[PDB]
Design a protein around this ligand. Structure first.
Ligand code: CGF
Ligand code: CGF
Ligand code: PLP
Ligand code: PLP
Lengths: 810, 810
């Protein structure tokens, strides 16, 4: 047992054991003679869950009595991952449960691997919402996460013949012990219908009703006895729905399809009706719940003082016109009063600037599905543009640029413009991203209302991303500076005075080595793959995207291979290059990149001359639980997006906190990370944002790089001739064609500096002691990237509430 | 507290209370400050459920150790109703729970009303399966009920404007505390595909796979610590199903629709593909489970010694060719050996002779959906007909009459012929029905294999149908003869010596009066209806069918009304005529009969001259839980089906056990009931089966009755002129037209004798003491109709197992 995992008290281990047996018997209805590891996992889950309820009930009763300002975090994604270990950590039950299960003759680690990941997210945005919930509970905020309970989360990725295959993520198959259905709080959500304009007000009539049933999941704070709630809505058809008879009952599934599956698109907008329905569904049900709770705390003037609604991207942007609809149509507030309340209540967070991710809904869709909302949006636009016109007289082009309504082929509603107009605060997720918003994408809006624009650099929770996934590192750190850093990451600074400590250097390096061995093992257990634990672990894990430039990584891998074949008997630092991540099902290029990766592995991993000096592995089904395994085992973190494309990134922070050195561009949060640790302790390379713009003025011509770089030329010719695809020589023609003629991300432009920088990485890896000292400098300055810091800033600068580290009663 | 409800021990009431609070807190995650009656209901349900698990686990472990012959009852319907009270009764926990909830300040009766009925049945057949499960557990048989877990059971009936409106029965909305999902025992079920004939055997290939997930529900025996299992299969799509991406996931619902809803047809065959899929689904999954269990007890010669499969009607008839398919195709047994095993394993129960209920599946359907099964069926037919030909040389018409394959418009498979050929026993459900089977419908089969044909008169469980729904009557009976009768109904005979006991007569009458007051109250509480508790309660509750002749009842009601209007100031015994029951959604005539009933009520209930002398009420949404309320309150039980159409009936038995006198035809079980009680203690009338046949030889002409009976003529003319439908004068033209020209059930032919008999009923009701004495004679001789007797006969004469009343350890 390690200290950070809590006490294994005599009374509590005994108590845990009997409750474990009580659940195995009464809850699972099994005896030890027929129980399987899955049954044991559930008995433990229910036992741990029991320890939450008491705190869950009093935390909620507490907010009712004290009635503080409530924070409502709206998101269509909550990438939670597993819940068992996280709950034990936050409740200081890990050692006790470890001991109790040991005495019962069970391996707790084995049982934890049985829990299904709650993959209700695509990547960064979804995981961010998960970390935020953890931090809000840890900071004692009366916060509620509101989303959709998808029956099927992000698809499970299978690699067949080197190609990605998708398969339904039936995560609820065996049940979810963490959620509590609350059918008694079901709410109606309306769709379609039409608008009637009577004397005293407008009415939305003849609508189709879909019921929203909530499921509450507890969110425990870190050892503070606070347990907040994540409420996920599930779609249910009313019983007089479609109510020949048999068909009517079977068609109920049409309404319930709303919460059936998560759209697997990462940073890509798909204007499908089902998606719009999901967006309104979560917004409509959530706002009724919010108002309900407010009325039970009718002057809505105090609404903004008791309520804060954070829009995680534009996905829940309809909350703005829906709030107006309720206040104006139902509560009968005058427009101006309602608008004042709405603006002071809502705050919007922008997560990316790439055009293809921007939500622009066709007017004909809103027209049919949400007719009243379209009218309200036009009215908002009208009044907003009148403000612009009055502020910039005669600037007609500004008017059309700022309109919420876009003209052209088909009229569309720019949801981002909607969010800015209806929110009192708009923030980017990293300093460079937030500046870009003010200088480019939202320049006009910044000029009209500069006070609205802020920055809130993303963060990650040190509980899941350090204590839970890397207990070995958390321990040696605790041995030196104590445990307070877990909820006050800035304290990692104190580790700076141990940078020359021989014992510490040895331990940091030991923990990393153990993590690598453990992962190298896992690799062979669950995926029959052998790798060399002494090689440098070069990993790039994140969603497959052209802007993330996994292709640039591929070019380097091929460069290393060609250099070896050129001078076989020359020494080179051994490397295990790991690339993982899912591609959206309809993203052809992303799928081709995955195939290219496996194809490279096919050649490189079986070339006798290469030996154990270079291995290319594609990490299958990258998800939260897998991230918890690879990140602690990584030596090199690849964050190589084209400058200006990765708003922030969060994977980068996870790697920094876990002892990996970072090679990357001055993009997103990488800029602040290098700033915190010192550029000398970072492997920075490539074009800066300014260089990218210069190149665009000039005109990006990939041919130029192809002509001046022999090594690069050789790689393109290998791809083109079928060197990596013998049976299908032209298999990668699309990739080559894109790289050569329409590469929006300038892969070639950063190639030279990238491989040069990679050489410096290998040189430092050859000096174990200095590599580790640089690692210590990174870990020691990663404190700023704790989501506790991020949330404390949202709380003070946007929501107007004070965080608190006070422990609620037992 | 009453004695039959068990002891309210000090230690147990205290234990019940803390467990109730434990579940309210830990299971429901609620505090007393926000708990609602529904929450309290669930805390109690979970508390009671806890007492079952221990016994459930040891009963099953017990069967594993002793390895007795297993009884598998296959049914597409299990009309369970509520489970809470039934479980308390069988566990002797009712008084303890009553006391415990009282001390917690709660009314247990109020909480019981919150439980949703498990309406996985249409009527008789489904309820029979429910009573059988209870009796099998009570008789200590290693029995398993196998069916489908429909998401939506029989529809909830609403009456709008006097018309039936159907609405989804979302019985799982708030959850089901009684079931235990067993995803770990999921089994694959195949559909479509084609048949490949290789060297060593035929193969069913290229099939579509649907997963069958089981849900186990405990079935407690009466105070014997035996808890059997009812396993209901749920359809689940495999995860690589349909696996653009979004659509594939959404289409998963196509496979899962198999267990979505119960076909609401009572005694009516609808040849829909979805229905056939349900039938094979339950059969395929069940047989794999059966074999699996057998192999874990490979000579299948002992299979019939360890396994008995009872086919509840022909719905699960595919079990015969499916068993053959597995034994021949998979286990590789020779045809003849496999057939021997199949016949000795299967037994079939026929429930009705009406042609429209007979399952005749089109060959093109089986051809596409189950190609291998069709081949096996042809092979079975071939070999069966060769036996017929050898037994009746030259009788060519017999060959075509007995074929499993019917020629004509479209070829069809007669599933009933299939069941007879592949079963070692075939039984009817009442003596007269079973005789009819041998003399008519299955005469040819009886001639070929007389040994196969048996009778097993239906029964009802005295636990739910006496102790649970009529505790007052069970008590006064127990006060005289003890409690042993509850599991040995024949003991009610002893009540015969109390027929002249003044105290008993007074009590029997008192209990009935209390039941009537309680129901008259319930009527006003949940349906705003006032009735006179002193009137005779004339009730007919069962599914709406033309053969049940609710119309004959209607004619009598109108006769009574016309007679009153004719001589207003003449005295007549007051009556409250209650008719209830659901009509299949597509059964037009049944729906018109419901409207006619309400229409009569509209006129009769508001005629000042009638006063409180006659009331016509239509009991809305008749279901099991409602039956438990009306039956104990009834004075007169209407069992007036045309002789030869009601195979048995079971409602009739429920009324007899509960103190109601019976007016009915010599049909189904009515014949044995009158035989047991004595015809003098029964109100028998109308044509006997022989009279019906004579009339058919002759030719049924309704006009004749219309011409010779003035009162009948007046009624038809009232219906025709719009007397009961002012706004829509021709509203009942279909009814009149049917009665006059195409009445298959000869309503007019029994009219005269029916009203005459009804007059005798009223005369006896005028003499309270003698009416009650006749009631005692009925209750005292109802013992034979206990499903314990029925099951003991199935056990000994069909399954080859001995029932046992031995109590398993605690
Ligand atoms: N939605 N969105 N965009 C992202 C993402 N999910 O990847 O949001 C994440 C959370 O803000 C950012 O770190 C990331 O750079 C940005 O591209
Ligand atoms: N299926 N079927 N037929 C019936 C029914 N459900 O009503 O089976 C019941 C159970 O055997 C019989 O009592 C009844 O007379 C017969 O019509
Ligand atoms: C943290 C995380 C991400 C975000 O990673 P980036 O490299 O910022 O894109 C995506 N997926 C998972 C499973 C994560 O844990
Ligand atoms: C017993 C019962 C039946 C069968 O009644 P019959 O009069 O034999 O048709 C039908 N429905 C319910 C709810 C029952 O309890």
């Amino acid at each position: 047992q390690i200290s950070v995992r809590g006490l294994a008290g005599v009374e509590n281990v005994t108590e845990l054991k009997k409750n474990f047996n009580r659940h195995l018997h009464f809850t699972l209805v099994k005896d030890r003679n027929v129980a399987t590891p899955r049954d044991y996992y559930f008995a433990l889950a229910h036992t741990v869950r029991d320890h939450l309820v008491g705190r869950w009930i009093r935390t909620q009763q507490h907010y009712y009595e004290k009635d503080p300002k409530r924070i409502y975090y709206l998101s269509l994604e909550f990438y939670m991952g597993r819940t068992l270990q996280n709950t034990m950590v936050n409740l200081a039950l890990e050692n006790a449960c470890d001991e109790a299960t040991y005495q019962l003759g069970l391996d707790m680690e084995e049982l934890e691997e049985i829990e299904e990941d709650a993959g209700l997210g695509n990547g960064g945005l979804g995981r961010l919402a998960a970390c935020f919930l953890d931090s809000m509970a840890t900071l004692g905020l009366a916060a509620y996460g509101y989303g959709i309970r998808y029956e099927f989360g992000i698809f499970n990725q299978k690699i067949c013949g080197g190609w990605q295959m998708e398969e339904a993520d039936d995560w609820l198959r065996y049940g979810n012990p963490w959620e509590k259905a609350r059918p008694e709080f079901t709410l109606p959500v309306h769709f379609y219908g039409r608008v009637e304009h009577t004397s005293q007000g407008a009415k939305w009539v003849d609508t189709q009703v879909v019921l929203a049933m909530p499921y509450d999941t507890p969110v425990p704070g870190y050892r503070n006895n606070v347990v907040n709630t994540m409420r996920l809505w599930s779609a249910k058809a009313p019983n007089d729905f479609n109510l020949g008879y048999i068909q009517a009952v079977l068609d109920r599934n049409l309404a319930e399809n709303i919460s059936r599956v998560l759209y697997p698109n990462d940073n890509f907008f798909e204007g499908k009706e089902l998606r719009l329905k999901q967006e309104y569904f979560v917004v409509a049900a959530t706002l009724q719940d919010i108002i309900r709770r407010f009325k039970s705390s009718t002057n809505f003037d105090a609404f903004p003082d008791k309520v804060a609604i954070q829009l995680n991207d534009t996905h829940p942007s309809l909350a703005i016109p829906e709030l107006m609809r309720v206040l104006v149509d139902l509560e009968r507030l005058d427009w101006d009063k309602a608008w004042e309340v709405t603006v002071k209540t809502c705050a919007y967070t922008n997560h990316t600037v790439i055009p293809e991710a921007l939500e622009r809904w066709p007017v004909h869709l809103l027209e049919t599905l949400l007719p009243r909302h379209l009218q309200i949006i036009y009215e908002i636009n009208q009044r907003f543009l009148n403000r612009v016109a009055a502020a910039f007289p005669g600037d007609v082009d500004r008017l059309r640029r700022m309109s919420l309504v876009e003209e052209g082929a088909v009229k569309r509603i720019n949801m981002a413009h909607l969010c800015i107009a209806g929110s009192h605060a708009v923030n980017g997720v990293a300093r460079i991203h937030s500046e870009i918003l003010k200088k480019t994408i939202f320049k006009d809006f910044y000029e009209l209302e500069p006070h609205k624009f802020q920055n809130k650099t993303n963060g990650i929770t040190p509980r899941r991303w350090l204590v839970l996934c890397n207990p070995g590192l958390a321990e040696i750190i605790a041995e030196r500076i104590g445990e307070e850093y877990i909820s006050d990451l800035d304290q990692l600074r104190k580790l700076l005075s141990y940078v020359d400590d021989e014992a510490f250097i040895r331990d940091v390096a030991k923990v990393k080595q153990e993590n690598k061995l453990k992962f190298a093992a896992y690799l062979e257990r669950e995926y029959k793959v052998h790798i060399n634990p002494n090689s440098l672990f070069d990993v790039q894990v994140k969603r497959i995207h052209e802007y993330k430039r996994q292709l640039l990584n591929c070019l380097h891998v091929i460069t290393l291979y060609n250099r070896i074949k050129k001078e076989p008997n020359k020494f080179v630092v051994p490397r295990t290059v790991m690339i993982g991540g899912k591609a959206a099902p309809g993203y052809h290029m992303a799928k081709m990149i995955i195939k290219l990766i496996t194809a490279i592995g096919d050649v490189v991993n079986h070339d006798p001359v290469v030996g154990d000096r270079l291995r290319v592995i594609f990490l299958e089904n990258y998800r939260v639980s897998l991230a918890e395994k690879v990140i602690p085992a990584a030596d090199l973190s690849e964050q190589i997006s084209t400058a200006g494309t990765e708003a922030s990134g969060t994977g980068n922070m996870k790697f920094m906190l876990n002892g990996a050195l970072t090679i990357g561009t001055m993009d997103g949060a990488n800029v602040e990370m290098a700033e915190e640790a010192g550029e000398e302790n970072f492997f920075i390379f490539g074009m800066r944002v300014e260089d990218v713009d210069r190149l665009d003025q000039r005109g990006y011509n990939a041919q130029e790089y192809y002509d001046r770089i022999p090594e690069l030329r050789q790689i393109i010719e290998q791809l083109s001739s079928g060197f990596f695809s013998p049976k299908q020589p032209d298999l990668f023609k699309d990739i080559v064609n894109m790289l050569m003629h329409h590469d929006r991300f300038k892969v070639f432009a950063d190639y030279e500096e990238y491989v040069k920088c990679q050489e410096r990485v290998s040189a430092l890896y050859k000096n174990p002691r200095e590599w580790t000292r640089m690692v210590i400098r990174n870990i020691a300055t990663s404190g700023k990237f704790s989501s506790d810091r991020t949330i404390a800033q949202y709380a003070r600068e946007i929501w107007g509430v004070e965080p608190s580290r006070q422990r609620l009663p037992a």
